[PDB]
Design a protein around this ligand. Structure first.
Ligand SMILES: Nc1ncnc2c1ncn2[C@@H]1O[C@H](COP(=O)(O)OP(=O)([O-])OC[C@H]2O[C@@H]([n+]3cccc(C(=O)O)c3)[C@H](O)[C@@H]2O)[C@@H](O)[C@H]1OP(=O)(O)O
Ligand SMILES: Nc1ncnc2c1ncn2[C@@H]1O[C@H](COP(=O)(O)OP(=O)([O-])OC[C@H]2O[C@@H]([n+]3cccc(C(=O)O)c3)[C@H](O)[C@@H]2O)[C@@H](O)[C@H]1OP(=O)(O)O
Ligand SMILES: Nc1ncnc2c1ncn2[C@@H]1O[C@H](COP(=O)(O)OP(=O)([O-])OC[C@H]2O[C@@H]([n+]3cccc(C(=O)O)c3)[C@H](O)[C@@H]2O)[C@@H](O)[C@H]1OP(=O)(O)O
Ligand SMILES: Nc1ncnc2c1ncn2[C@@H]1O[C@H](COP(=O)(O)OP(=O)([O-])OC[C@H]2O[C@@H]([n+]3cccc(C(=O)O)c3)[C@H](O)[C@@H]2O)[C@@H](O)[C@H]1OP(=O)(O)O
Ligand SMILES: OC[C@H]1O[C@@H](O)[C@H](O)[C@@H](O)[C@@H]1O
Ligand SMILES: OC[C@H]1O[C@@H](O)[C@H](O)[C@@H](O)[C@@H]1O
Ligand SMILES: OC[C@H]1O[C@@H](O)[C@H](O)[C@@H](O)[C@@H]1O
Ligand SMILES: OC[C@H]1O[C@@H](O)[C@H](O)[C@@H](O)[C@@H]1O
Ligand SMILES: [Zn+2]
Ligand SMILES: [Zn+2]
Ligand SMILES: [Zn+2]
Ligand SMILES: [Zn+2]
Ligand SMILES: [Zn+2]
Ligand SMILES: [Zn+2]
Ligand SMILES: [Zn+2]
Ligand SMILES: [Zn+2]
Lengths: 360, 360, 360, 360
């Protein structure tokens, strides 16, 4: 078929909503179309030419962008789990052959590129196109019919879930809990006030932390209310610096900010590094900074992507939260765009949290 | 009563072999004398007045030095475990009241000072003194009569054992091993060529790694032959940069060296921060460094101290090693000084690996 | 002070809804009264005189009953957690001094009786008594107002939460998940159709298993439609005997049943032993039964009670379940009885799953 | 070519030392002969026709016996690890395709037969034959040259190493250690006094348990002296049954003995099921037995086979054991037979711990 798609020339950049030749494989398990597609900094970086690791699939001269997808099943081979008209979230990362990839933890690929591949990013077409072919195993079923568009948030939230898995694994190094066995009063601070930070914060809340998002500027009454609704605090760190931190999560990617907060981490504290900012400036880490980490048995863990199981978990949390605080969750999606509006990739709609593309 | 002791005034500095008065209780669990006491950069740090976290015990104006000890039991209340004559290594770190401290994991204390205390470092006298009283529970019996003074390596080595427990905990985040279940071919790089570096290296070979110590200068042939007898490599990184590192351990405390090597760590790799040097110059860590860690799901863990179980493990390894490689082990101890030679806190013996005090 | 209270004389037993002398003890942080109190087979066994291990507090002729409780606070000290008016679930098990109690894991008491004590079973007065004094540490706050009397279920659920924590720990022996990383299609069978079974089935369902409860007879369309509403299957194992089980949980306590179902467990299966029936006759375990277990690497884990953190989790679960299936959870509590009505300790309201007691 | 081999007809039984044709396959990485092959209850069970699971390889009328082997490399493709003349221990279990097999954890195969296969047991020729072809990856190199024939104990010891890994996983359900962090004074009881019991006991001692083997008769003086050389105790439980057991390992396969000792296990105790005897008679387990397990948070784990990493751990233990207790370890091997002494598969020569065939 000829079909519509939003494409880049990876890694060169640019973006055009335009038509393309894309033939059916004789061999397919499932055929789908896109309902919603979220966009994040990674897409904007792709478009902007800022990411040297991205590439078009083999023997092609464009890449269909889009990896934060909510899709609907048009057609599907015989199976016990999905049927026509079922909504699904498609896996971003797909496995290679490495000891991790082969048990479905391509999120911890031991090789990196080119063992694993990511839809819309590294050698595999994304989801901003009229038709999509895939294998059933790569699709996670949306089981709550009430969520609708909220399900598009699955992809950003699964990364949060894997990060908390990493938290759970490394915090086993000691007794992290209070001596009553609980997390009551343990302090989570999240660097940043964006999409990922919100999702960190809500999960933090469900695990029983006291949570505080932080930024180098005040926030909008909109965001403030959303946080208030979840029982999440906020602080401008130029005005009030949190200390005595048990769980530090960075979404900024900024070193100066990371290390100033690390020097507030308690004994047996855990630092999750999540944010990318290759442009971020150097911050000098000195011997006293190293000593601070050592003497406190602090763990700094970098986390990227997630496994299928974490997509399932993300859907379950999106449901729980939608049924308890619908206005807040709905407010996460702050603009819906038509596929023509390709200027979303260079410019942020006003007061953005999560921008998405409604397809028809 | 009056006894000989080697003392300082923490944190100001100074060292004197000298006469002091110390209570001699008539009620005690155990009474001991020192046979050998080891020294390490912490001892040298305290005496230069370079460590501002050290203090003397409450209501005193000196601090007996020495935390790496082998002691002999003079007398002991009746018990199932030790008797008069036996050799023992005393716990350096003594528990407070925290959740970690109360299960004998004071190495992981949730509070720090003043919950936990360290013999010879923080508010508790050390072992460089003619007489010592202690509880039996704080002593680890040497079960092997052929070890002799090698048992004095128990204390620096127990730190290694806990760092490896930390490795084992955090490496559970992914499959770290080969797809045959082993560590065959996994690569460990230890920054430094000093005593802790050797002991890390030896435990790593036992684990199954291929190991390379590294430093910014060439090494004496004494050390080179010691490495060779254990199958440990060596390389001077200003000439051959090791690459593709699965486990990295730093004993330097130096930021620039640490981060230089962090950029060679593979996916799912682990970095143990161990060494500390508060005067080490700042290294600028930038956005791309952070990214490197994030994208590879790397863990950077600070480790300090160990529990009693790690002393027991350390003695078991010392004795596995000794009945396999007698001479290279003996060769770890490079100078048996006399209590009065207190210039050793200022001045390193030529070719120092481990200097020990031989106690009268 | 005189108060109305239902009590017994353990281990002999028998119930009367009397009044008794309960003086206001010296040191106490909270004064409570019972709103609702659940009951179960342990409360009935206690009345019969069925249970060897129960007994009365030191030097008292009687024992207040009830361990499944929702309670309201009447007065409390200045604190950041609870106030006049908040409703709470109280800890059943209160810790002794062993390595596990002292970290708040008295559910894993290393000593057993008399280190730990259970309110209403082992030397500590239960909660069916007009006034209750307690420390704030032993109280769990209900943070959801819509829950009302649902929160009575916190105690039976919290045992289920601990059990699934045991499953999580022990199933690490091997990769339990599918090669996609998920639990999709893994088969949980819960032996029995009672209240704990329902609570296991719902949690199973949230963990991603295909769940079937089973029994030796068909079940009330009342029960069958709750199962159906959650997506839990049912089967009577005289008509159909389920096969290829990955997680087998017993609420029956009956050996013959446990072991017939153990013989259907797959490789790497986990068996949770939960229910206890001291009267159940013997079933003959032979050589081949053992071999079945050995060659399949199966784990059989007994589980009892739970820690505070699991009371919190059980509360979060009820709030999530309530807000998504309000009608079905509500239906779990089948009868609100009055203290006066003490037939309940001998007889079941028709097709009763949970029987609550409303307090005057 | 025509070679000698010891063969059975599985599962029918029978044994004979005879000639067979072993063609040189087209592609092989390694060519080996046997130096020693250990025999165990499984080999005798096969030859007796008593094992239903065993089968001949595809399209053959016989099955070469022997799975406990030490081999010498006659020829091998060039590689980094083994060369001509090296001694190796080969893997018994070879992987299939399931999620555990493909990470080298076929010891935990999720399918059972015919996914995994066992040399000498299940559709794959054993090692009692003059020539053997294999892949390098399936061979574990003997690095210590003084071990000699002691290395043949690798295969029964790696089973123990895996069972201790299973112990390490399951005992994380609570704090199993003392409040000093150690295992000092924890009690391990091993049901049985054969070679597996001894290897369990030696590892138990190295783990820091107090260990006692037990049987239903007194033991010979050789065995008693060996226990004594390692500090392992013994008891005829007809006369004196150990109580207060923290870790119970069974090597008998006998239900009656198992369940009787299960009733001595402490809170948080672990029972490893290891031995198997399909012929052993039923023992009735009642409601009270089950409740004992539940109320004590006891785990009962069946354990079979091992992974490659556990063959390597086994060889490191056998070296550590050999360089400390030379004659004791040599004495585990109690009869060296000739291949034609097929009588050893039917009669336990007098004093047996481990019988081996020295291959001509
Ligand atoms: N110095 C600072 N101090 C405090 N806050 C600062 C600072 N500098 C920047 N920020 C804030 O960081 C937050 C980042 O959110 P986002 O809008 O980039 O979008 P997002 O969706 O929330 O994602 C955050 C990160 O996740 C990265 N990501 C995306 C996908 C996967 C993974 C992974 O590791 O798995 C990581 C993504 O590329 C990005 O770096 C915003 O609130 C920024 O504020 P402002 O701009 O409003 O001032
Ligand atoms: N830039 C560099 N690049 C490569 N190597 C370098 C560099 N700078 C210094 N080194 C080498 O680091 C090693 C330090 O060893 P050490 O013998 O001074 O003392 P140790 O007993 O082996 O331990 C060293 C560190 O461990 C620390 N420590 C000790 C005990 C316990 C713990 C703990 O966390 O539990 C930590 C102690 O505070 C100290 O900082 C030597 O080989 C140094 O070589 P050279 O300058 O001599 O040629
Ligand atoms: N042979 C059998 N085959 C299949 N099903 C059978 C068989 N025998 C009895 N049952 C069913 O077992 C269930 C028992 O649960 P329950 O509602 O009496 O009470 P609950 O509150 O749900 O608690 C059940 C068990 O948990 C025990 N418990 C309770 C709380 C905590 C813990 C712990 O380990 O921490 C243990 C308690 O002592 C009791 O044994 C009912 O559905 C019974 O059926 P029917 O009566 O409909 O015929
Ligand atoms: N009622 C009893 N009470 C106390 N002891 C009893 C009782 N009945 C029999 N025994 C003793 O248990 C031991 C069996 O040892 P073995 O050397 O014949 O066998 P092995 O070569 O050491 O192998 C141990 C077990 O593991 C099985 N196995 C072997 C290898 C691996 C695995 C696995 O799960 O991975 C399992 C093998 O078939 C056997 O069942 C002997 O000491 C027997 O004593 P007696 O005969 O002197 O009177
Ligand atoms: O490294 C590329 C990563 O980009 C992120 O924005 C996606 O959420 C991940 O799925 C992906 O693996
Ligand atoms: O300096 C503090 C640390 O010093 C090390 O030298 C000792 O080995 C540790 O036990 C101690 O916690
Ligand atoms: O029998 C012991 C257990 O019985 C159960 O019904 C209770 O929920 C537990 O808290 C109690 O300790
Ligand atoms: O199933 C038979 C088991 O028997 C034991 O003798 C072997 O050591 C195992 O490798 C084998 O898996
Ligand atoms: Zn994204
Ligand atoms: Zn991969
Ligand atoms: Zn030191
Ligand atoms: Zn502490
Ligand atoms: Zn109950
Ligand atoms: Zn206790
Ligand atoms: Zn065998
Ligand atoms: Zn398999």
């Amino acid at each position: 078929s000829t079909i519509n798609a939003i494409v880049t020339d990876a890694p060169k950049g640019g973006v055009k909503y335009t038509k393309i030749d894309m033939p059916e494989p004789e061999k397919y398990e499932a055929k789908l179309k896109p309902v919603y597609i979220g966009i994040c900094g990674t897409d904007r970086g792709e478009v902007a030419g800022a990411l040297s690791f991205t590439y078009n699939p083999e023997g092609e001269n464009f890449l269909v962008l889009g990896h934060e997808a909510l899709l609907q099943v048009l057609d599907v081979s015989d199976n016990n789990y999905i049927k026509r008209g079922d909504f699904v979230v498609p896996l971003v990362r797909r496995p290679g052959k490495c000891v991790n990839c082969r048990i479905g933890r391509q999120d911890n690929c031991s090789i990196g590129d080119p063992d694993k591949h990511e839809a819309g990013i590294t050698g595999l077409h994304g989801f901003m196109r009229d038709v999509i072919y895939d294998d059933i195993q790569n699709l996670v079923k949306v089981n709550d019919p009430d969520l609708g568009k909220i399900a598009v948030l699955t992809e950003p939230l699964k990364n949060v879930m894997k990060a908390f898995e990493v938290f759970d694994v490394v915090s086993k190094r000691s007794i992290f809990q209070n001596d009553d066995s609980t997390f009551i009063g343990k302090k989570m601070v999240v660097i940043g006030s964006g999409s990922e930070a919100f999702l960190y914060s809500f999960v933090g809340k469900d695990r029983g932390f006291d949570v505080t998002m932080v930024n180098r500027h005040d926030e909008t009454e909109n965001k403030m209310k959303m946080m208030d609704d979840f029982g999440v605090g906020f602080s401008n760190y130029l005005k009030d610096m949190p200390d005595k931190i048990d769980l530090l999560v960075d979404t900024s990617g900024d070193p100066s900010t990371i290390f100033k907060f690390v020097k507030k981490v308690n004994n047996n504290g855990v630092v999750i590094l999540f944010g990318f900012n290759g442009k971020a400036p150097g911050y000098p880490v000195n011997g006293e900074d190293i000593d601070y980490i050592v003497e406190r048995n602090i763990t700094i863990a970098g986390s990227v992507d997630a496994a299928k199981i974490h997509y399932v978990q993300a859907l379950d949390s999106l449901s729980n939260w939608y049924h308890r605080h619908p206005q807040t969750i709905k407010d996460i999606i702050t603009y819906e765009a038509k596929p023509e509006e390709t200027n979303i990739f260079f410019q942020k709609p006003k007061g953005e949290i999560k921008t998405v593309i409604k397809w028809p």
